């Protein structure tokens, strides 16, 4: 019965949709970007990529059993880490750059140390305890990491102890994505049940739940201000949710776009929204005007991952073609 | 690259590229096989005879050919979210137990449904399937003890192994909808070791030859 109460509470706050208020704002115009760097060397499908905090180094993971740290400026390969399992699904870069984490169909998450005295990359910790495939992971600090798995649950792990201190439960379907808030106090996850849930890291309990998607949610990302987030699903629509309002603001979709989103990201100011599609083309959407401002068609197979530098200078894209492209 | 300590970085990158290419050129000449089947389908026997908690990889060599087999039944998760990761495998191995009438979740019907779902999957349009029918010895006693009509009310053949096995094989092979695109290889598992590996090698060789003929434009 509480669902009806929640519906009544939410419907009363929607006096005017964000589309009506945005009618006064001028359009963003046309945005066009070109490929300045082509990162090659991977021989299989690439699944995950994450920009470093310095906005120069990035790490990408491929199903060939290798994840490479790339120097985005000179395109030089800094490290080549041979993995024990080639079925990777996600990768992450530590904020301090001291450690790198990756995982996939194996039910464990591996963390690698880059600043070893011997000079070679070595395994630091293997976080076991999950039963389903690892889906996503993001570092909070050098000693804390939050991971997602296909077991429909998320857990917080202490690398030093090597066990999950807290467990997050409540999702019906497998969790497909995870994103940390700017202050790291909260994080959100998307699941196959088409609902997005906000979880409290400190208390380890769900605070809010969001729905509206007609199919599985594949990607999720916070708005730079942290008061809203966007999700990507197989619906071929992007939906933005506001935490304080607890209601959807708008949905970005087009009749032409079959085979909906696979990845989502925001610019530094959040004016434009970048999403990766199964059409191996990345479409740039105006977060306020809800219009497509450009298309980064530079791949052949599929856009699996993409990310915007913390500085906002450039945006990198990954693909099943085994090549990465950086746009500006 | 002009400055010092930058040419050394370029040399390091070149060495990394050389190592990556050398590693890649070795994996390309390895046959990848996907292993499927229920927990009670008898998959463990195949690994046991070849060798004599997530994805499990088995490596073996037969007549100068290298094989890699991946078991995906270890982890329980949404299949459609990760099945595409195995796209491009040479062939798919499917295991079914003939005597799988002990419990009703009907396990034979579940196996048939799983076979239909995997065979007609979009990611495996051109991928052939190798079907292993295990527990023939137990099925020999089961057919005498219990009738085959218990699972197939429409069955009208004699209650004998020679007819029951053929009926099951025909029923399983009829599920595929794209016979012009792929072929199904059926083998009855035997206690002796050599038959299984030899059959797998023969199927792989036939698939390779047929693919080459198709590329040439003859097949």
């Amino acid at each position, epitope marked *: 019965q509480l669902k009806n109460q929640i519906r009544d509470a939410r419907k009363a706050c929607a006096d005017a949709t964000l589309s009506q208020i945005t009618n006064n704002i001028d359009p963003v115009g046309r945005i066009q970007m070109r490929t300045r760097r082509t990162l090659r060397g991977h021989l299989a499908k690439i699944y995950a990529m994450h920009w470093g905090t310095d906005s120069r180094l990035l790490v990408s993971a491929s199903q060939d059993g290798k994840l490479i740290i790339w120097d985005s400026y000179t395109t030089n390969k800094v490290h080549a880490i041979p993995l024990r399992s080639s079925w990777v699904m996600t990768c992450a870069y530590a904020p301090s750059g001291n450690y790198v984490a990756c995982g996939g169909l194996d039910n464990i998450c591996s963390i690698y140390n880059l600043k070893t005295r011997e000079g070679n990359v070595r395994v630091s910790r293997e976080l076991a305890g999950h039963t389903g495939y690892l889906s996503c992971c993001r570092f909070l600090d050098d000693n804390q990491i939050v991971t997602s798995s296909g077991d429909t649950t998320c857990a917080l792990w202490d690398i030093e102890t090597g066990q999950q201190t807290t467990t997050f439960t409540g999702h019906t379907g497998d969790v497909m994505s995870l994103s940390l808030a700017p202050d790291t106090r909260l994080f959100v996850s998307g699941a196959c049940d088409a609902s997005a849930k906000l979880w409290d890291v400190r208390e380890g309990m769900c605070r809010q739940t969001f729905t509206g998607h007609e199919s599985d949610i594949n990607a999720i990302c916070f708005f730079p201000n942290g008061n809203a987030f966007a999700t990507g699903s197989d619906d071929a629509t992007c939906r933005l949710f506001d935490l304080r309002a607890d209601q959807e603001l708008m949905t970005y979709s087009h009749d032409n776009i079959i085979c909906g989103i696979t990845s989502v990201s925001f610019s530094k100011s959040g004016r434009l929204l970048l999403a990766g599609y199964d059409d191996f083309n990345c479409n740039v959407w105006d977060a306020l005007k809800a219009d497509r401002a450009g298309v980064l068609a530079g791949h052949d197979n599929r856009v699996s991952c993409l990310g915007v530098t913390d500085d906002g200078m450039a945006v990198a894209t990954g693909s099943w073609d085994s090549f990465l492209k950086i746009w500006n | 690259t002009l*400055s010092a300590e930058d040419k*050394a970085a370029v*040399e390091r990158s070149k*060495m990394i590229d050389r190592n990556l290419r050398e590693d890649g050129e070795k994996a390309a000449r390895e046959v990848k096989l996907l292993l499927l089947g229920a927990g009670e389908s008898g998959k463990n026997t195949i690994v046991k005879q070849m060798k004599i908690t997530g994805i499990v990889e088995t490596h073996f060599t037969f007549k100068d050919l290298h094989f890699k087999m991946f078991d995906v039944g270890a982890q329980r998760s949404e299949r459609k979210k990760w099945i595409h990761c195995f796209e491009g495998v040479t062939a798919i191995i499917f295991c079914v137990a003939l005597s799988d009438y002990d419990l009703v979740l009907n396990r034979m019907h579940a196996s048939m449904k799983l076979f239909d779902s995997i065979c007609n999957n979009k990611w495996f349009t051109d991928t052939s399937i190798i079907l292993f029918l295990n527990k023939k010895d137990l099925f020999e006693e089961k057919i005498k003890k219990s009738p085959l009509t218990i699972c197939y009310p429409e069955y009208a053949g004699s209650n004998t192994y020679e007819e029951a096995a053929a009926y099951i094989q025909c029923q399983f092979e009829d599920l595929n909808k794209r016979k012009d695109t792929k072929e199904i290889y059926t083998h009855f598992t035997c206690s002796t070791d050599t038959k299984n590996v030899q059959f797998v090698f023969d199927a792989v060789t036939d698939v390779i030859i047929k693919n080459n003929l198709k590329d040439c434009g003859l097949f």
Partner: single-chain antibody, 230 residues
């Protein structure tokens, strides 16, 4: 750790072969340098070989007379010498180095060996030879170069080394702004263009030694005259 061997008494015009053994780290991925120190003078770079033996360099004073080679399987380094001269007498040190974005070259130095024989480059200038110091005081060391070390990419290739009495040189600051791992926070370095300085806060007896500056903008590598603190 690094241990060098091959020293002893040699006569002019003879031949000798130094050897160095490395363990505890991935020798194959680290480039090796040879640096020799005369018995009563400063440091002098000898030769360098990159990882994989793809590049080799020699100094003019020893070009053609010496030879450098690697045996990665055994983590061993060699330095063949021929036609030894009177000036070749010096203590030879093996130096570990690696080159990648964010790396710290010359971070480790070997113990070294003694060799005894009977009988356009960038110049690094240190104005002060000796500086009296006492515990608790702040001390500054000045350096200058005949050529600008600020490359177009923005990197300033200045290195600072400290050689305590009876000990081999140890890396202090690299690229003029980065403290080597394990170096106390007290040490700090800053500079611009052709002038550079090193500053120590709350100096202690452990800081006694000779401070050497080096440049890595281009070969050959040149060390400074060195400043003594006591």
């Amino acid at each position: 750790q690094l241990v060098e061997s091959g020293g002893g008494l040699v006569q002019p015009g003879g031949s000798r072969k130094l050897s160095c053994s490395a363990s505890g780290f991935a020798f194959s991925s680290f480039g090796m340098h040879w640096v020799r120190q005369a018995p009563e003078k400063g440091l002098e770079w000898v030769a360098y070989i990159s990882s994989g033996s793809g590049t080799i360099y020699y100094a003019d004073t020893v070009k053609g007379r010496f030879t450098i080679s690697r045996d990665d399987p055994k983590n061993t380094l060699f330095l063949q010498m021929t036609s030894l001269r009177s000036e070749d007498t010096a203590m030879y040190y093996c130096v570990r180095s690696i080159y990648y974005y964010g790396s710290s070259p010359f971070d480790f130095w070997g113990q070294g060996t003694t060799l005894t024989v009977s009988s356009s480059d960038i110049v690094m200038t240190q104005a002060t030879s000796s500086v009296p110091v006492t515990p608790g005081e702040s001390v500054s060391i000045s350096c200058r170069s005949s050529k600008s070390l600020l490359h177009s990419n923005g990197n300033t290739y200045l290195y600072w080394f400290l050689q305590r009495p009876g000990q081999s040189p140890q890396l202090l600051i690299y690229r003029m702004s980065n403290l080597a791992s394990g170096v106390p926070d007290r040490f700090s370095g800053s500079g611009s263009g052709t002038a550079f300085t090193l500053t120590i806060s709350r100096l202690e007896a452990e800081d006694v030694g000779v401070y050497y500056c080096m440049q890595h903008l281009e070969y050959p590598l040149t060390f400074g005259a060195g400043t003594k603190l006591e």
